[PDB]
Design a protein around this motif. Structure first.
Motif, short mmCIF file in Angstrom:
data_model
loop_
_atom_site.label_atom_id
_atom_site.label_comp_id
_atom_site.label_asym_id
_atom_site.label_seq_id
_atom_site.Cartn_x
_atom_site.Cartn_y
_atom_site.Cartn_z
N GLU A 111 0.71 -1.48 0.14
CA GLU A 111 -0.15 -0.45 -0.37
C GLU A 111 0.47 1.26 -0.12
O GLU A 111 1.34 1.41 0.64
CB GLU A 111 -1.19 -0.23 0.98
N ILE A 112 0.67 2.27 -1.56
CA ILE A 112 1.34 3.17 -1.39
C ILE A 112 0.17 4.28 -1.25
O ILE A 112 -0.75 4.63 -1.39
CB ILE A 112 2.13 3.48 -2.39
N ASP A 113 1.05 5.94 -0.36
CA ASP A 113 0.42 6.77 -0.68
C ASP A 113 0.89 7.86 -1.15
O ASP A 113 1.69 9.44 -1.65
CB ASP A 113 -0.12 7.56 0.96
N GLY A 163 -0.18 7.17 -9.35
CA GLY A 163 1.20 6.68 -9.02
C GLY A 163 1.15 5.03 -8.18
O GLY A 163 2.87 5.74 -7.67
N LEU A 166 3.71 4.93 -11.91
CA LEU A 166 4.77 6.05 -11.77
C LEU A 166 6.09 5.45 -10.61
O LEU A 166 6.86 6.01 -10.71
CB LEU A 166 4.84 7.17 -11.27
N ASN A 167 5.47 4.37 -9.40
CA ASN A 167 6.47 4.07 -8.64
C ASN A 167 6.84 2.83 -8.98
O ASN A 167 7.20 2.19 -7.81
CB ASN A 167 6.05 4.44 -7.13
N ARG A 170 10.45 1.62 -8.04
CA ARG A 170 10.58 1.15 -6.24
C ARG A 170 9.90 0.03 -5.67
O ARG A 170 10.69 -0.43 -4.64
CB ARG A 170 10.43 2.60 -5.00
N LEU A 171 8.77 0.22 -6.11
CA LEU A 171 7.67 -1.15 -5.48
C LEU A 171 8.51 -2.48 -5.82
O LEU A 171 8.69 -3.33 -4.52
CB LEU A 171 6.03 -0.81 -6.07
N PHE A 174 11.58 -3.00 -4.39
CA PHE A 174 11.00 -3.55 -2.53
C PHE A 174 10.21 -4.72 -2.71
O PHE A 174 10.71 -5.37 -0.89
CB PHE A 174 9.84 -2.85 -2.02
N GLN A 176 11.80 -6.68 -4.18
CA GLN A 176 13.09 -7.24 -4.38
C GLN A 176 13.37 -8.11 -5.88
O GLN A 176 13.86 -9.28 -5.97
CB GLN A 176 13.98 -8.60 -3.40
N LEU A 337 10.65 0.27 -17.03
CA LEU A 337 10.00 0.35 -16.40
C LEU A 337 9.40 -1.62 -16.33
O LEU A 337 8.35 -1.72 -16.66
CB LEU A 337 8.58 1.34 -15.68
#
Ligand SMILES: Nc1ncnc2c1ncn2[C@@H]1O[C@H](COP(=O)([O-])OC(=O)C[NH3+])[C@@H](O)[C@H]1O
Ligand SMILES: Nc1ncnc2c1ncn2[C@@H]1O[C@H](COP(=O)([O-])OC(=O)C[NH3+])[C@@H](O)[C@H]1O
Ligand code: NI
Ligand code: NI
Lengths: 519, 506
Positions: A111-113, A163, A166-167, A170-171, A174, A176, A337
């Motif tokens: 979950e991201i914000d 959102g 675009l991330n 890094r997701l 995370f 790996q 990506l």
RNA sequence: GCGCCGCUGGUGUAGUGGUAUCAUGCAAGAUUCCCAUUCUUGCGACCCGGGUUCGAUUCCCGGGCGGCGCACCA
RNA sequence: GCGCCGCUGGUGUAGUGGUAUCAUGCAAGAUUCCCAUUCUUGCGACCCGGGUUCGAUUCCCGGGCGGCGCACCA
């Protein structure tokens, strides 16, 4: 069925009339769409017992008791903008919390914000900007500017999805670099609708819970699918729709294997959505999953539709949008990506060691406002005796108030026992509502039932008169009540609110309440 | 006194948060919180709900961010943050003034410069609602106005009785000229706000006794003009000395202290500063400030706004926003009528929580480096707020360990304990570093004694101390859970469980 | 906003008008069996646009972002 | 958006060119002592701006909001 059959036939004829019109954009699926709309409406008009809610009464209850209200109503209001009151907000966080346990903690989703403010190039890339300007030209999005003056044109996000995309990098990192994984965000989305209507059904701002499930195209099969395979739920395939057919209760496993549903990843989420929606109060007999036809879609798409006083409305979309948004943003920004997996046997004079993977995306989008409004209708009931007494049959897990503390009278002997209970419940994490007002116990039962308080503890005379101090516990729906020790009722209510016991079990263990006899 | 660079490197690498739209170049003042940051944030919010909303039975509501212009005109936000500026134009509609400025040939009163036609300068995010553009609007700069505008139904929900408090948790927007200092100055941030409505006659709080004994640093206005530093005082003992105006201000100051402490802000780097008469209307204001590498920053602002909010909106809309209470006895030109009740215009006390700053404070106040390796960084997040309560770690990648990892994880999930499973390639120390880095509260390690001893037991490791005990795998989920809820501490665990002296197998 | 200095794998870092060094990180395989072990391999970068040039990551301009300062801080 | 009809205490509902009816709800005092009990009292309303008018909640223009129908539906 006698009145529906001709309309069904009609839809069918123009149905694969269309299939013929392309078997060898002049063609009018618009004509087809009209005919199916007729059928839809008349089947709806034929079905009622009347099985369906008195909307005007329910809206009155929601209004009077501030479940939700027009935003800025004191200033004349703004069309399509709503505020949630105490009960509304509480019900909402419960629905969101349940959603978190059911999806995020269950599937270990990331979950991201993200910010609601979005720069213009981002939305031009996804084609939102191009797709929602119209006939002076006005955009169906909310445009704004960031900073000094007009140096950076931006919009309020129409959706929560972007959102995550675009991330992605890094997701993925995370997790790996391993597929599969899933990200989620719960937040507000904005639609500058030209005509907001039907209350919470179509608004200009609403809360959306979105999930992007990223998966290797080589590996689009979900390991947990047999947890939902034997579920029976209503499906409305594109075939069924164009055949003039109605929805049909199937087994999930069958619908996947038969190929009605593409894969077990999309299927898993359909099953999980079903389980969730029903858990929060939506009725299975008034819930269907409808596949998108050719003129509305991406490999596959299924909307979850609930039957309401407004007809069938989509509350959860679940799309298969294999590659696109990741690819579209990738080319736009020139930033790759993708994921990668090591080749077993290395390999145009280059020797490869890994192959890049462009992940497929499964996207369940939840409209919490509509979900909440559906729950309102599917749980609204009127007491058989008193037409003024209305109540909501909220499931205990989502009921805003799990309990109510009610002295039988404004009389003072009850007051210390009331104070005792509230604090106890407060330390048990049990949401409760204390009512020591001037009204009778029946009036205050009515008030508490009106906002869907799950259970009601009543302090009586035998609470103070007899040796073991015992109050009564009342079930909101049945109005039946038992008797138990004040010492333990906060545990009992906490248990019922968590779903560790049922009211049947409680009635079984503790004695029924035949009446007062101390007086 | 932290290595802000090193801490921020850690925050960036493990995706606590990041520049929003980074692959598009980025947008200053806008940040996306990643998995661990989002998790930490949620715990902060939930702890806040437990500490305030549940504890005080506050009425929490949820309003829209879109706010029509008249609302923000009334509150004064527009006439102060939304204007066209020559620098500045009002001193003397849209570019209608540009003609006026040229028509009267207004040069600058100072230096007599020719200057420019007024250009719009919005510190707020303006937009237009509807298809016409007849309804200008702004993104809310605060979450308070939603509460004030719904005061009647809030009061009615409390059956007309004062006092009552309402709260709201959502995003607020400020189109800052120069966004800077990471999360400390952003253009979008989550805010938690409480409006405590009280009878001006009875500006008191019955539960002040519960925080009067607290010793905390206070920095009064009369001490700021003197030059002297802040003094550690008894919270109760700031109140009879009139340092703190009333028990309501006192109660919330105490509760704010207990909360900021609970989420991990260090009591020695926390103080409460009284706003001076120079910076104000309002009756009184005490900010909660924290000591960071950026200096003393305001993270919670506790204000007293006698009446205005309710009175201004009431006068603007011609809609009375009042409570009534009955008189002891009916009382009686302009005088000829009989009165039975008197109107009460509620006084408002407003604790305002900036979650982003609060969180950043926790980062700086819990960041640490291991005494041996300068690459091993970690956050001493309090268990009740730590993004991951637990981690599941096989000592190695051997297949013997795998089934125990799978079972314990599922057990944790069913207990609700948020956990992370690191069964990847690295050594044990690597995965310890990896998980300490993001502040995983406790670490369960499955070793050779787990597979080779009669009852299956694993080790439970404390993040801070790096010490560990041994308990059986059926026990661990309940243990970890009770550590997370604050039911028990590590002392309790070492008292009930055998310390880990090393493994006897393998 | 204004001024100065900057932007090279996820994170650091070297380097240069002829498309890039080396650490770290992650991945795979070994090793190891309780605190970023060691070995081998693999993956990943010149902020973006324009100009000048046969050719720009490198030179000039602009935009975006960053650090510090002044300004403002609902 | 377009089209048609609407906006009177928190809720529902009468009514009118001279600022408004009755219920319901809430408050207070009694009553009653397990399902909106009963009596008395109290509190609270003409969506907003402009115009016409001696005077508008009423009449007239505009705006906002609502209910429908058609559109549209990330
Ligand atoms: N104008 C509106 N008002 C309220 N809810 C809406 C809405 N538009 C969509 N929703 C809800 O949000 C969900 C997502 O909306 P959508 O299908 O337009 O966007 C997406 O699926 C994002 N890819 C829908 O399933 C629906 O329940
Ligand atoms: N630009 C910004 N970036 C991050 N947080 C901010 C911020 N502006 C304000 N805050 C946070 O919001 C809180 C309130 O801000 P404020 O004092 O400007 O508004 C008020 O007075 C509340 N009515 C502050 O204590 C701070 O924690
Ligand atoms: Ni870099
Ligand atoms: Ni009305």
């Amino acid at each position: 069925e006698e009145v529906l059959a001709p309309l069904r036939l009609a839809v069918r004829q123009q149905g694969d009339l269309v299939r013929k019109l392309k078997e060898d954009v002049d063609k009018a699926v618009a004509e087809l769409k009209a005919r199916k709309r007729v059928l839809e409406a008349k089947e709806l008009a034929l079905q009622p017992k009347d099985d369906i809610v008195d909307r005007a009464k329910m809206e009155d209850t929601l209004k009077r008791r501030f479940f939700y209200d027009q935003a800025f109503a004191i200033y004349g209001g703004v069309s399509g903008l709503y505020d949630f009151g105490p009960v509304g907000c509480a019900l909402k966080n419960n629905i969101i919390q349940t959603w978190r346990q059911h999806f995020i903690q269950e599937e270990q989703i990331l979950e991201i914000d993200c910010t609601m403010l979005t720069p213009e190039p981002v939305l031009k890339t996804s084609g939102h900007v191009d797709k929602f300007a119209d006939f002076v030209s006005f955009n169906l999005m909310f445009k704004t500017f960031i900073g000094p003056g007009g140096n950076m044109p931006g919009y309020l996000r129409p959706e929560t999805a972007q959102g995550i995309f675009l991330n992605f990098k890094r997701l993925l990192e995370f997790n790996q670099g391993k597929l599969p994984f899933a990200a989620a965000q719960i937040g507000n989305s904005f639609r500058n609708e030209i005509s907001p209507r039907s209350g919470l059904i179509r608004v200009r701002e609403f809360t959306m819970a979105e999930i992007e499930h990223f998966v290797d195209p080589s590996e689009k099969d979900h390991p947990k699918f047999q947890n939902v395979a034997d579920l029976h739920l209503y499906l409305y395939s594109a075939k069924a729709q164009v055949s003039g057919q109605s929805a049909r209760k199937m087994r999930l496993g069958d619908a996947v294997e038969q190929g009605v549903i593409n894969n077990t990843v999309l299927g898993y989420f359909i099953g999980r959505i079903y389980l969730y929606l029903t858990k929060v109060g939506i009725s299975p007999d008034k819930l269907r999953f409808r596949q998108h036809m050719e003129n509305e879609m991406a490999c596959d798409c299924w909307d979850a539709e609930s039957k309401t006083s407004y007809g069938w409305i989509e509350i959860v979309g679940c799309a298969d949008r294999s590659c696109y948004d990741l690819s579209c943003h990738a080319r736009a920004t020139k930033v790759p990506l993708v994921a990668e997996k090591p080749l077993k046997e290395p390999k145009f004079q280059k020797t490869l060691y890994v192959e890049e993977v462009v992940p497929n995306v499964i996207e369940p989008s939840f409209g919490l406002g509509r979900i909440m409004y559906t729950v309102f209708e599917h749980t609204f009931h009127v007491r058989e005796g008193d037409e003024q007494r209305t109540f909501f049959s909220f499931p205990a897990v989502v009921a805003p108030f799990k309990c109510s503390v009610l002295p039988l009278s404004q009389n003072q002997e009850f007051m210390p026992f009331v104070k005792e209970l509230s604090e106890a419940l407060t330390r048990h994490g049990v949401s409760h509502k204390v009512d020591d007002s001037s009204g009778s116990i029946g009036r205050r039962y009515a008030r508490t039932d009106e906002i869907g308080v799950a259970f009601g503890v009543t302090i009586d005379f035998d609470t103070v008169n007899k040796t073991p101090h015992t109050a009564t516990l009342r079930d909101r729906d049945s109005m039946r009540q038992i008797r138990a020790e004040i010492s333990e009722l906060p545990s009992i209510v906490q248990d019922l609110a968590n779903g560790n016991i049922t009211w049947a079990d409680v009635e079984a263990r503790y004695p029924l309440f035949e009446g007062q006899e101390t007086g």
